[PDB]
Write a protein that binds this ligand. Structure first.
Ligand SMILES: *[C@@H]1O[C@H](CO)[C@@H](O[C@@H]2O[C@H](CO)[C@@H](O[C@@H]3O[C@H](CO)[C@@H](O)[C@H](O)[C@@H]3O)[C@H](O)[C@H]2NC(C)=O)[C@H](O)[C@H]1NC(C)=O
Lengths: 17, 48
């Protein structure tokens, strides 16, 4: 059911999706 | 890994393994001569 799978205040963590 | 797995699944339940995001050396697999029969009904070995 997993067509694709990849495995492997002081801060701000931005993101754009 | 699939072809040279120690245990090959029986005719009863032919196992399905999904491969994605990989470089497919189809030419190298064809180059391997250990497999007695390599038959493509719907694909071209040169074009693979
Ligand atoms: C991914 O989605 C779910 C994960 O929970 C599972 O769905 C099941 O997969 C089977 C076949 O792989 C599908 O069978 C379907 O059943 C209906 C009604 O019985 C029928 O008309 C068809 O034969 C249709 O293919 C169905 O999506 C579902 N099984 C059931 C009993 O509902 C499965 O792990 C994964 N695959 C699919 C296709 O969802």
């Amino acid at each position: 059911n997993c067509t694709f799978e990849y495995v492997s205040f002081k801060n701000l963590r931005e993101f754009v999706f | 890994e699939v072809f040279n797995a120690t245990r090959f699944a029986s005719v009863y339940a032919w196992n399905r393994k999904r491969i994605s995001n990989c470089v497919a050396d189809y030419s190298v697999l064809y180059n391997s001569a250990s497999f007695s029969t390599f038959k493509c009904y719907g694909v071209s070995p040169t074009k693979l």
